[PDB]
Write a protein that binds this ligand. Sequence first.
Ligand SMILES: Nc1ncnc2c1ncn2[C@@H]1O[C@H](COP(=O)(O)OP(=O)(O)OP(O)(O)=S)[C@@H](O)[C@H]1O
Length: 324
Amino acid sequence: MTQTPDREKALELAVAQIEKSYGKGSVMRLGDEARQPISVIPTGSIALDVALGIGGLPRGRVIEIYGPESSGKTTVALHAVANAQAAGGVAAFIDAEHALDPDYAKKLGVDTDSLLVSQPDTGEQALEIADMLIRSGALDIVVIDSVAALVPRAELEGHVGLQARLMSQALRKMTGALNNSGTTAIFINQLRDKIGVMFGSPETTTGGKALKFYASVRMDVRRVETLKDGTNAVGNRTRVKVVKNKCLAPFKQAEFDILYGKGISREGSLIDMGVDQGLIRKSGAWFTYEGEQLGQGKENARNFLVENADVADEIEKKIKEKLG
Ligand SMILES: Nc1ncnc2c1ncn2[C@@H]1O[C@H](COP(=O)(O)OP(=O)(O)OP(O)(O)=S)[C@@H](O)[C@H]1O
């Protein structure tokens, strides 16, 4: 067909009808300019925030964070918690592994004292407690630690494919409530793997499958390199790839530093995105910003930004006017 213009029209229209019956994120162009909702939960790392597209985590949606052990998931999660908490929101933490360390989550900014924690007896119980806790339209963010620990009441006593089904049913029922309250739920998913080929890789089937689909955003978190600090190791450089995102164009990635015992270095994210946005200038060893200097080396800069809270906000701000 010698078509050309009218093509874009029927296409535009097509999209419209699809979006109309399946959702506003059903189809997208990897380049489309991202949408912007009113409420969103910062992840605590400008970098990942503007990789998610909407500048944080979507509300009333099921988010999945998977990856190896010690990649970062929990931290990322606890931050999504501490943030939603700062704005006077209430969070709950369904525990199925018993590996939380308040003292750490405290340093992250989580008001642990008023943090609702539950330690279910069975798998179904976890999801159901999570359900009514969700339906009270009282929770802002709810986090279920470790999918693979939600063992079915059955297995916990007396066949086959029980976890995957338990999840299916749970997610079906729970999916509705969430969207009805704006409560966003984070599912931490371990992988227990990292012995294939020469590096890392993706998968699911633990109870996954269900999640993989119901989930509106799926983050692949993995550890890139163990941050050298002259001494031993301040933290690690985490790399997160959102492979699913029914809210903004998917497949965008981000990297950031997580200091041992400290968590996600906000400052550190400011600098990096800072330079990759022309706002911060790097004059060989030196890190300059709008004229006056910051420091010699990323660390001396982090530090400078970390104690000059007043100027850091200035930088986080502009990057936000420069994209939002
Ligand atoms: N209680 C803690 N004390 C000190 N450092 C911690 C603590 N919890 C996490 N970290 C650091 O945070 C990084 C990983 O975050 P994790 O909470 O282990 O998340 P994952 O989501 O990485 O978790 P498993 O899967 O490793 S619990 C590591 O580089 C740790 O050094």
